[PDB]
Each structure stands twice: as C-alpha cells, then as structure tokens.
Amino acid sequence: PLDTTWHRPGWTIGELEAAKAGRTISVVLPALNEEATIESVIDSISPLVDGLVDELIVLDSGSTDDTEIRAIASGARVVSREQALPEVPVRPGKGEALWRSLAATSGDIVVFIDSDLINPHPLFVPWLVGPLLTGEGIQLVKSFYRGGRVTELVARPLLAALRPELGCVLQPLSGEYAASRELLTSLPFAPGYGVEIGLLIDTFDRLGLDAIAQVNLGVRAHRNRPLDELGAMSRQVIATLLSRCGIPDSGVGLTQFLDYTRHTWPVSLVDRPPMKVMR
Amino acid sequence: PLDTTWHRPGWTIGELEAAKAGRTISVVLPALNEEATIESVIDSISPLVDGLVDELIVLDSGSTDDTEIRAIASGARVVSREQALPEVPVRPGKGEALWRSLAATSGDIVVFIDSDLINPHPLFVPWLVGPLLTGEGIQLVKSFYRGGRVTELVARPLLAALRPELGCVLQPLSGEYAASRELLTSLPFAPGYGVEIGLLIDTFDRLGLDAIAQVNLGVRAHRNRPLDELGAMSRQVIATLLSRCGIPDSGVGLTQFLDYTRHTWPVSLVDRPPMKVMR
Ligand SMILES: O=c1ccn([C@@H]2O[C@H](COP(=O)(O)OP(=O)(O)O)[C@@H](O)[C@H]2O)c(=O)[nH]1
Ligand SMILES: O=c1ccn([C@@H]2O[C@H](COP(=O)(O)OP(=O)(O)O)[C@@H](O)[C@H]2O)c(=O)[nH]1
Ligand SMILES: O=C(O)[C@@H](COP(=O)(O)O)O[C@H]1O[C@H](CO)[C@@H](O)[C@H](O)[C@H]1O
Ligand SMILES: O=C(O)[C@@H](COP(=O)(O)O)O[C@H]1O[C@H](CO)[C@@H](O)[C@H](O)[C@H]1O
Ligand SMILES: [Mn+2]
Ligand SMILES: [Mn+2]
C-alpha cells in the first residue's frame, strides 16, 4: 500500500538535479547542543550546495555548547529560533525549531536531517528527494534504517491500534525526511518530540498513502539517550498521536520516581498553526 | 493519594499469620518454560507453607522444558491450564493462566509471583500480604522495585495521558501482587500480557485508590527479553488499556520488519469474564 524503495536508489546526483525543473531544495539541520556531531553532518551535505541543494541552514535551538561556532566553521548558515521568526516569542522543543525553519528557508522542497547522527552517508539528501523529484503525487518521504525503543514500543504499536493503515511505515518517528513546502506550510506542527508523528498522521489524513514514500538509508547511528529522557519523549508522542485520533489527552505530565525522588516532565497540547497563516 | 510502604515493613511472619483471623492465603506461580528459575522461586516461598501460606501451586502454562519436573521436585503442586478448569478449552497467554488459577486455588487471599525471578527474597509474600492483613479497605497490593522498558515508555505515560489518577503507581505492570479473592473473582481478566494493567484499572474504577496499596520489594532481577518480544507485549498492554478507557482498538496485530522480513504478532480483544459466573 506504500511506495517503498527497498534497495539503494539507482539515480545519480546529476539526474536528480536535472529533475528539479525549477524547484528549489532547502536542507534544515535542527540542533540543540550537538557540538560533537554537527560538523560531520554539515560536511556530509555541503558538497551538494549550489548544485542539488540550494540552501543549508542549522537551526540552533538554544545551544549552550560550541554547536554554533563549529557549524559556522563548517561554512553553514546558522539561524537561531529568534531570527527565523522574531515577532513570535520562542517556545521550547523540537517541533518549534522545525516549524520556525519554514520561515527561514525558501526551497520548494525541504529536507530535515537530525544533527546528532554519527557519520551520515553523503547520499541521505539525494536518497530522500528521489521520490519527490521523480515520482508523481509523492509529497512526503520518510526514511528507515538499521534499536529504536520509542518507535518499536510506543509509536508502531499505537499506530497499529489507532491508525492501522500506517502499519506499513517502518520508522514513523524518523528524524530524516523530506516534503514539499506546500504540504509543510499547510500542516500544523506538534510541539516537542511530537512533530514527526504529527506530520505523518496529518499528511496521511489529508493526502492518503499515495502521497507518502519511504526510502532505505541502510544503517544510522546516533546518541542513544537514557531511558528516563525517553519517557518524556514517549509521553509527548502519545499526546500528539491521541489528539490526531480524536482522543482527549489529560495534559498531565509524566512523573518519574528515580529512597526515591520525584520529577514531573512537561507535556504540551499546543500545536503551532500552519505557517501559511503567517503570510 | 496512594497508601505506599516506602521502607521494609516492620511486621513479622508470626504477627502476619496471627492477623489472618480465619482468612486463607494462596500463592500462584504462573510458569511458561522457566526451568532455569522455577526452583529458586518455589524454594523462596515453600518454607511458609502450612504457616502463613496455606497453598502453593505452579500453574504450568504449557511448558515444553523441564519446568514441571523441577517444580514437582521442589515439592510444589503443579496444575496445568487444562486441570484448573477442564470444561473450558485453553487459550494462549498469561492472563488465561492467572484467570484459571482462581479455579485451582481456594485462599481468601491470592498472591501472584512471577516464576522467572532471579533469586527472589523470601519475604516477598509476607511483604505483599501486609496491607491486606493489617490494613482496612485494601483489596489489591502492587509491588515496586529497582529497567522496565514497557512500564516506563508505554504503561506509565499512557496512564498519565488517560488515567492520570494512577500516576502515583510506580510499577503498574508488576507481576508480583496480592489481592482478595472477592475482588479477583469479580473482575474480568485481560488476555496475554494485558492482565496486570487491566486488573489495576478495573480495581481503581470499582474501588478507587483507597483500596490499593503498594510495597517496596527493593530490587528484582529477571529475564530481560529482546526488544521484538516486548513489542507484542506493549501492543497487548495498549489494547487492554484503551479498552478500559472506552477507546476502540483496531484489533490489528503489530507487524515488524526484521533485505528485511515480516512477521505479524497476535493481539486479543477478548477478556475472560469474572470467574464468579462459573459458579
Ligand atoms: O528542543 C530541541 C530538541 C531537540 N532538537 C534536535 O532534534 C534532533 C533530535 O533530537 P533527539 O536526539 O533528542 O531525539 P532522538 O533521535 O534521540 O529520539 C537533534 O538533532 C536535536 O539537536 C532540537 O533542535 N531542539
Ligand atoms: O503464556 C504465558 C506467558 C507468560 N507466563 C509467565 O508469566 C510470567 C511473566 O512473563 P514474562 O517474563 O514473559 O513477562 P516479563 O516480566 O518479561 O515482561 C513468567 O513467569 C512466565 O512464565 C505464563 O504463565 N504464560
Ligand atoms: O525511535 C526512537 O526510539 C528514538 C530514539 O532511538 P533509540 O531508542 O535511542 O535507539 O528516536 C526517534 O524519535 C526521535 C524524536 O521523535 C527522532 O528524532 C528519531 O529520528 C527517531 O528515531
Ligand atoms: O515492565 C516491563 O518493561 C517488562 C519487562 O521488563 P524489562 O523491560 O525487560 O526490564 O515487564 C513488565 O511486564 C510483564 C508483563 O506484563 C510483567 O510480568 C512484569 O512484572 C513487568 O515488570
Ligand atoms: Mn537522535
Ligand atoms: Mn519477567
């Protein structure tokens, strides 16, 4: 039911670029304190700039390490959350960074790549844009790869329960994906870590499976977070997914008991609206 | 909001036994292929038999290893699913084993202990029965301990979303707990791995928090399953939890893509009814 490219696409950078046909391509790297990895990621993509890729920015989501200076030193344009859209006060979380990035880019096609990847392949961007460039009706491309605890324990089983039509999607939460600006500026953006699952469900509801493709990127490595930070992420994924399914979420943050101690993590039920309204 | 015993209970086996006041206590160990651990678990509890504990059975849920012979050799009464309730054909899964165990025991109080625990403390059963024996209105006692991936990523965040009143429960899926027969024979039993979360939500809805206590067992160790088996368990926990919250579940099993291969795991939306109807 779902256009899946199972092996390495056969296209080439010169073919894909020809297929642009006046369309532009922006790449956004969201980054929060990724000084150890930001440079390797930027370098994997910057050789494409002024060719297949027209624009690369790092959206610096409030880093307090050396993320920004190392990104500048790799030749990337770095855009803070405030600069992307300064009339609107900044909220925390990943979804805010990606939503704002629409105002700081102008490509007809937008590619998101996480900045915490350990040594990413230089064809990620070409592999993701393939179906948007050479297909018909594809508006969103998700990646899969490779062990993804939230994906396999939370998102895929809840999708099977509540949107089983998306059961064929191998990595619904994947941070590497591309989509048309027309789609992205028409969809709301869930806060925090809810943004990927929200975009997938909203895209499906509006365009169906035929507008979605997925592409094998082989294997990917990244910062494996401790279980407690995953708990808050799972809570936000659940909150965003239930809302899309018409189920009322309590809005109560996850509490954890670490001779134990207690901490309550934030959860948000507030989406950003389609960036179109900002026109 | 929730009666919590945070340090080691101060009671003694002789005090607790005196407090029985004619009430009986059954212990059930569900077991599916636990030959490596069944013996250490039985031995931790059998010294209590004919004193605090009136009855110990192993409910052999279809083992094909040496579980049954090793349990017999530790002096335990072993009851198959068929023998517990032979007029009713056997279904797979943990919940079926626990539900049937009500027909093969007669204690006024029933204690469940998983049979895959690595070296369990001999006071587990005394610590769990404490609040049922010495409290008032306690009808269910859950344990906590100790890293519990389904609990921290699936069950606690979904409870926070959908039954936030149970947010103070530290280990909702814990396999070690005790309850009155009157409660257990009044509640349905969810299939598979849904049984613990189902019993907790059903108990709360019927009796509120004041009927539930929890007790610190310190640290517990057990067979840490691979992520893919956890995926099917999470799917069933989600299915049981959504049903209790009035949310329709698709009934679609989780599919996993392991040059990948596909497998679909069973999920069940069929509860067993209150054992009372079998009277
Ligand atoms: O408020 C935030 C949180 C995260 N990120 C970025 O979003 C990406 C994915 O975040 P994370 O690693 O925490 O998620 P994971 O992939 O580990 O589940 C990373 O490049 C982060 O730098 C961000 O820009 N802003
Ligand atoms: O169909 C089944 C599945 C499991 N069990 C028992 O239920 C307990 C808990 O099962 P499991 O270890 O798979 O769950 P976990 O604690 O690892 O999440 C164990 O003693 C199993 O032997 C059972 O009696 N029947
Ligand atoms: O899927 C997951 O379990 C997590 C983290 O992966 P691990 O459990 O650390 O292997 O990462 C997912 O979610 C993130 C936030 O939504 C995305 O940025 C990742 O790309 C996605 O894989
Ligand atoms: O909470 C969990 O993640 C799992 C398995 O624990 P691990 O992730 O292997 O540490 O076990 C829970 O669920 C089982 C089935 O419902 C219960 O039998 C366990 O007692 C409970 O801890
Ligand atoms: Mn990451
Ligand atoms: Mn276990």
mmCIF file of N, CA, C and O in Angstrom, chain A residues 147-150 152-154 225-228 230-231 234 238 254 256, chain B residues 145 147-158 171 173 220 222-231 233-234 237:
data_model
loop_
_atom_site.group_PDB
_atom_site.id
_atom_site.type_symbol
_atom_site.label_atom_id
_atom_site.label_comp_id
_atom_site.label_asym_id
_atom_site.label_seq_id
_atom_site.Cartn_x
_atom_site.Cartn_y
_atom_site.Cartn_z
ATOM 1 N N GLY A 147 17.688 -0.052 19.823
ATOM 2 C CA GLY A 147 17.236 -0.230 18.454
ATOM 3 C C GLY A 147 15.910 0.456 18.179
ATOM 4 O O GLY A 147 14.981 -0.160 17.654
ATOM 5 N N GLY A 148 15.820 1.736 18.534
ATOM 6 C CA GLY A 148 14.588 2.484 18.370
ATOM 7 C C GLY A 148 13.510 2.018 19.326
ATOM 8 O O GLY A 148 12.548 1.360 18.920
ATOM 9 N N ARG A 149 13.664 2.364 20.606
ATOM 10 C CA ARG A 149 12.775 1.856 21.652
ATOM 11 C C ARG A 149 11.404 2.524 21.596
ATOM 12 O O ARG A 149 10.373 1.851 21.703
ATOM 13 N N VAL A 150 11.363 3.847 21.443
ATOM 14 C CA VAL A 150 10.071 4.520 21.392
ATOM 15 C C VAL A 150 9.338 4.097 20.131
ATOM 16 O O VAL A 150 8.119 3.883 20.145
ATOM 17 N N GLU A 152 9.498 1.241 18.398
ATOM 18 C CA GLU A 152 9.004 -0.133 18.372
ATOM 19 C C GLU A 152 8.072 -0.447 19.533
ATOM 20 O O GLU A 152 7.259 -1.371 19.425
ATOM 21 N N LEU A 153 8.191 0.263 20.651
ATOM 22 C CA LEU A 153 7.332 0.001 21.798
ATOM 23 C C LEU A 153 6.138 0.937 21.883
ATOM 24 O O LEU A 153 5.098 0.544 22.418
ATOM 25 N N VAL A 154 6.256 2.165 21.380
ATOM 26 C CA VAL A 154 5.213 3.176 21.526
ATOM 27 C C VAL A 154 4.528 3.496 20.197
ATOM 28 O O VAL A 154 3.339 3.224 20.024
ATOM 29 N N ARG A 225 19.891 7.890 23.993
ATOM 30 C CA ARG A 225 19.506 8.544 25.238
ATOM 31 C C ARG A 225 19.179 7.574 26.376
ATOM 32 O O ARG A 225 18.809 6.421 26.140
ATOM 33 N N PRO A 226 19.330 8.021 27.625
ATOM 34 C CA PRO A 226 18.930 7.196 28.771
ATOM 35 C C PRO A 226 17.416 7.043 28.822
ATOM 36 O O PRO A 226 16.659 7.876 28.317
ATOM 37 N N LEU A 227 16.977 5.960 29.461
ATOM 38 C CA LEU A 227 15.559 5.606 29.460
ATOM 39 C C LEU A 227 14.654 6.727 29.983
ATOM 40 O O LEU A 227 13.534 6.900 29.485
ATOM 41 N N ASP A 228 15.099 7.499 30.985
ATOM 42 C CA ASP A 228 14.196 8.494 31.572
ATOM 43 C C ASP A 228 13.880 9.631 30.603
ATOM 44 O O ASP A 228 12.742 10.115 30.569
ATOM 45 N N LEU A 230 13.730 9.242 27.454
ATOM 46 C CA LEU A 230 12.819 8.609 26.508
ATOM 47 C C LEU A 230 11.399 8.592 27.051
ATOM 48 O O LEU A 230 10.440 8.569 26.273
ATOM 49 N N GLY A 231 11.242 8.593 28.373
ATOM 50 C CA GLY A 231 9.909 8.536 28.944
ATOM 51 C C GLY A 231 9.140 9.796 28.601
ATOM 52 O O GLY A 231 7.973 9.736 28.205
ATOM 53 N N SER A 234 8.233 9.756 24.841
ATOM 54 C CA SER A 234 7.101 8.872 24.618
ATOM 55 C C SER A 234 5.796 9.533 25.052
ATOM 56 O O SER A 234 4.794 9.478 24.329
ATOM 57 N N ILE A 238 2.704 10.145 22.532
ATOM 58 C CA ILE A 238 1.363 9.677 22.865
ATOM 59 C C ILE A 238 0.369 10.834 22.814
ATOM 60 O O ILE A 238 -0.715 10.724 22.229
ATOM 61 N N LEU A 254 4.235 13.333 32.595
ATOM 62 C CA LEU A 254 4.717 12.076 33.146
ATOM 63 C C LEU A 254 5.474 12.392 34.431
ATOM 64 O O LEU A 254 6.337 13.275 34.437
ATOM 65 N N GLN A 256 8.124 10.697 37.288
ATOM 66 C CA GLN A 256 9.017 9.566 37.472
ATOM 67 C C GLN A 256 9.565 9.570 38.889
ATOM 68 O O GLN A 256 9.819 10.633 39.461
ATOM 69 N N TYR B 145 10.093 -1.770 42.798
ATOM 70 C CA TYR B 145 11.432 -2.333 42.961
ATOM 71 C C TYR B 145 12.428 -1.578 42.090
ATOM 72 O O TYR B 145 12.094 -0.597 41.420
ATOM 73 N N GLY B 147 15.584 -1.534 32.311
ATOM 74 C CA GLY B 147 14.998 -1.036 33.543
ATOM 75 C C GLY B 147 13.495 -0.849 33.445
ATOM 76 O O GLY B 147 12.971 0.215 33.778
ATOM 77 N N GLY B 148 12.797 -1.886 32.986
ATOM 78 C CA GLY B 148 11.361 -1.811 32.798
ATOM 79 C C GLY B 148 10.986 -0.897 31.650
ATOM 80 O O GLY B 148 10.487 0.212 31.864
ATOM 81 N N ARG B 149 11.221 -1.362 30.421
ATOM 82 C CA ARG B 149 11.041 -0.525 29.235
ATOM 83 C C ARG B 149 9.564 -0.314 28.916
ATOM 84 O O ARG B 149 9.140 0.807 28.617
ATOM 85 N N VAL B 150 8.761 -1.378 28.957
ATOM 86 C CA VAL B 150 7.345 -1.215 28.651
ATOM 87 C C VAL B 150 6.696 -0.366 29.730
ATOM 88 O O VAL B 150 5.846 0.486 29.444
ATOM 89 N N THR B 151 7.081 -0.583 30.987
ATOM 90 C CA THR B 151 6.473 0.164 32.080
ATOM 91 C C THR B 151 6.738 1.659 31.907
ATOM 92 O O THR B 151 5.811 2.473 31.965
ATOM 93 N N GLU B 152 7.996 2.039 31.655
ATOM 94 C CA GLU B 152 8.359 3.454 31.664
ATOM 95 C C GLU B 152 8.064 4.146 30.341
ATOM 96 O O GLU B 152 7.902 5.371 30.321
ATOM 97 N N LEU B 153 8.030 3.410 29.234
ATOM 98 C CA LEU B 153 7.762 4.020 27.939
ATOM 99 C C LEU B 153 6.310 3.900 27.506
ATOM 100 O O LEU B 153 5.826 4.763 26.770
ATOM 101 N N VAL B 154 5.605 2.854 27.930
ATOM 102 C CA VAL B 154 4.247 2.583 27.468
ATOM 103 C C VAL B 154 3.208 2.795 28.570
ATOM 104 O O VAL B 154 2.370 3.692 28.476
ATOM 105 N N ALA B 155 3.273 2.002 29.642
ATOM 106 C CA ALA B 155 2.171 1.988 30.602
ATOM 107 C C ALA B 155 2.082 3.262 31.438
ATOM 108 O O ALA B 155 1.001 3.850 31.561
ATOM 109 N N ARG B 156 3.187 3.713 32.014
ATOM 110 C CA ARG B 156 3.091 4.919 32.829
ATOM 111 C C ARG B 156 2.737 6.151 32.004
ATOM 112 O O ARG B 156 1.886 6.944 32.427
ATOM 113 N N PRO B 157 3.353 6.370 30.838
ATOM 114 C CA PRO B 157 2.925 7.525 30.029
ATOM 115 C C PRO B 157 1.493 7.439 29.516
ATOM 116 O O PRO B 157 0.818 8.474 29.474
ATOM 117 N N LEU B 158 0.993 6.260 29.123
ATOM 118 C CA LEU B 158 -0.420 6.167 28.756
ATOM 119 C C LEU B 158 -1.354 6.370 29.940
ATOM 120 O O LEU B 158 -2.421 6.975 29.791
ATOM 121 N N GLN B 171 4.910 0.853 39.600
ATOM 122 C CA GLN B 171 5.084 -0.318 38.728
ATOM 123 C C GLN B 171 3.735 -0.935 38.363
ATOM 124 O O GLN B 171 3.389 -2.024 38.836
ATOM 125 N N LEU B 173 2.655 -2.572 35.842
ATOM 126 C CA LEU B 173 2.686 -3.882 35.198
ATOM 127 C C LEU B 173 3.339 -4.966 36.045
ATOM 128 O O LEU B 173 3.474 -6.100 35.572
ATOM 129 N N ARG B 220 14.590 -6.251 42.041
ATOM 130 C CA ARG B 220 14.213 -7.527 41.448
ATOM 131 C C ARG B 220 14.947 -7.664 40.123
ATOM 132 O O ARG B 220 15.186 -6.678 39.421
ATOM 133 N N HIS B 222 15.210 -10.275 36.514
ATOM 134 C CA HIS B 222 14.554 -11.321 35.738
ATOM 135 C C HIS B 222 15.097 -11.337 34.315
ATOM 136 O O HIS B 222 15.937 -10.517 33.932
ATOM 137 N N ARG B 223 14.597 -12.299 33.536
ATOM 138 C CA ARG B 223 14.941 -12.470 32.129
ATOM 139 C C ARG B 223 14.622 -11.210 31.339
ATOM 140 O O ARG B 223 13.447 -10.897 31.122
ATOM 141 N N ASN B 224 15.644 -10.478 30.899
ATOM 142 C CA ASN B 224 15.403 -9.277 30.107
ATOM 143 C C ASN B 224 15.178 -9.728 28.666
ATOM 144 O O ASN B 224 16.118 -10.141 27.979
ATOM 145 N N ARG B 225 13.927 -9.644 28.212
ATOM 146 C CA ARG B 225 13.552 -10.063 26.867
ATOM 147 C C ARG B 225 14.098 -9.162 25.758
ATOM 148 O O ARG B 225 14.387 -7.983 25.983
ATOM 149 N N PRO B 226 14.267 -9.707 24.551
ATOM 150 C CA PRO B 226 14.677 -8.885 23.407
ATOM 151 C C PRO B 226 13.566 -7.922 23.010
ATOM 152 O O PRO B 226 12.381 -8.156 23.258
ATOM 153 N N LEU B 227 13.968 -6.828 22.365
ATOM 154 C CA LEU B 227 13.033 -5.749 22.056
ATOM 155 C C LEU B 227 11.813 -6.214 21.253
ATOM 156 O O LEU B 227 10.706 -5.700 21.458
ATOM 157 N N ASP B 228 11.978 -7.174 20.332
ATOM 158 C CA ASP B 228 10.845 -7.541 19.476
ATOM 159 C C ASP B 228 9.732 -8.238 20.257
ATOM 160 O O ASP B 228 8.548 -8.005 19.985
ATOM 161 N N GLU B 229 10.075 -9.103 21.217
ATOM 162 C CA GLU B 229 9.029 -9.700 22.045
ATOM 163 C C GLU B 229 8.342 -8.637 22.893
ATOM 164 O O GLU B 229 7.149 -8.757 23.190
ATOM 165 N N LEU B 230 9.083 -7.601 23.300
ATOM 166 C CA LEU B 230 8.482 -6.502 24.047
ATOM 167 C C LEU B 230 7.488 -5.741 23.186
ATOM 168 O O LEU B 230 6.551 -5.133 23.714
ATOM 169 N N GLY B 231 7.675 -5.752 21.868
ATOM 170 C CA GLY B 231 6.779 -5.007 21.004
ATOM 171 C C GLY B 231 5.385 -5.599 21.061
ATOM 172 O O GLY B 231 4.394 -4.873 21.173
ATOM 173 N N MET B 233 4.171 -7.335 23.482
ATOM 174 C CA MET B 233 3.627 -7.176 24.825
ATOM 175 C C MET B 233 3.038 -5.783 24.953
ATOM 176 O O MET B 233 1.928 -5.599 25.468
ATOM 177 N N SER B 234 3.792 -4.789 24.492
ATOM 178 C CA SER B 234 3.328 -3.411 24.504
ATOM 179 C C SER B 234 2.022 -3.268 23.726
ATOM 180 O O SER B 234 1.082 -2.613 24.192
ATOM 181 N N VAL B 237 -0.706 -4.501 25.927
ATOM 182 C CA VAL B 237 -0.950 -3.601 27.045
ATOM 183 C C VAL B 237 -1.756 -2.408 26.554
ATOM 184 O O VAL B 237 -2.698 -1.951 27.215
#
